[PDB]
């Protein structure tokens, strides 16, 4: 459980600390803007149903329904575990005493530092799996339908590359409101001089992808992805949301810790493309 008893800070400092962590998180995240979340289940949940795999079954229309339109899965369900992410947070024992009878404001810079590191860990998890827990991620799924790019420092080669990627998405019979996430050097080089056919390439790419091109430092140097943002293709599961809890009563100070439990579910590994 959290603190809120036998703890140093009083209510106002709690509110300020929580506001700081929320604000820096909300600025930092570039993954939770592309995947709608499965609502807050609760603290105790540790497993979520992970729907198995894919099909290309189309709905049918007739005069009287006998097509039987079977949304069918017969293998298993293979639930998965909900991990935890955190980072340490320590202040001092003297500074609070100052904030009792001294310069009143209490600096909480460590909160911004810790929450920023935690959110970077988020976006590293969603964009990449890890061997130890054997999870999955956008650039590390299986059957991603990739396509080379290799044509930049060009007027607009990235445009034809993303068009090829979208066409490959369409050939698999999967399309909709697209979205794009890209790496630093690419996101700048594409933000370059207009394509001699209008304006900066970003505007063309946004009128194409139609759900915003976004930036992520945590992604590798020279890769990028496109998805079909619609639910039932990707999802995000939350047990509890980013919050800060008192940890313990170490040597004399008061270290805290920030928590959140997340998991992405790539239900349909057909909404992917990479290098």
């Amino acid at each position: 459980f959290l603190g809120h008893a036998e703890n140093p800070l009083r209510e106002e400092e709690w509110a300020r600390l929580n506001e700081t962590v929320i604000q820096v998180a909300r600025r930092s995240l570039v993954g939770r803007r592309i995947l709608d979340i499965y609502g807050p289940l609760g603290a105790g949940v540790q497993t979520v149903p992970y729907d198995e795999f894919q099909g290309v079954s189309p709905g049918a229309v007739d005069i009287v329904g006998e097509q039987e339109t079977a949304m069918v899965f017969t293998d298993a369900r293979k639930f998965k575990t909900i991990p935890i992410i955190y980072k340490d947070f320590l202040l001092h024992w003297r500074d609070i005493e100052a904030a009792r009878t001294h310069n009143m404001p209490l600096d909480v810079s460590a909160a911004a530092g810790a929450a920023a590191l935690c959110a970077q860990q988020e976006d590293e998890l969603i964009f990449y799996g890890d061997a130890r827990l054997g999870y999955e991620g956008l650039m590390t799924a299986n059957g991603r339908l990739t396509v080379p790019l290799g044509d930049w420092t060009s007027p607009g080669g990235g445009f034809q590359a993303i068009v090829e990627a979208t066409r490959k998405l369409n050939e698999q019979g999967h399309f909709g409101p697209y979205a794009v996430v890209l790496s630093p050097r690419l996101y700048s080089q594409l933000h370059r001089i207009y394509e001699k056919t209008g304006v900066l390439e970003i505007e063309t790419i946004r009128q194409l992808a139609s759900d915003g091109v976004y930036q992520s430092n945590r992604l590798r140097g020279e890769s990028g992805v496109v998805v079909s943002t619609g639910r039932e293709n990707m999802d995000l599961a939350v047990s509890m949301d980013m919050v800060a809890a008192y940890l313990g009563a170490s040597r004399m100070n008061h270290p805290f810790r920030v928590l959140e439990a997340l998991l992405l579910r790539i239900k349909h590994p057909d909404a992917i493309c990479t290098l």
Partner: peptide
Amino acid sequence: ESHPLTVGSLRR
């Protein structure tokens, strides 16, 4: 608690 949802729903 079990359903505050402090920072979420960033319009995806």
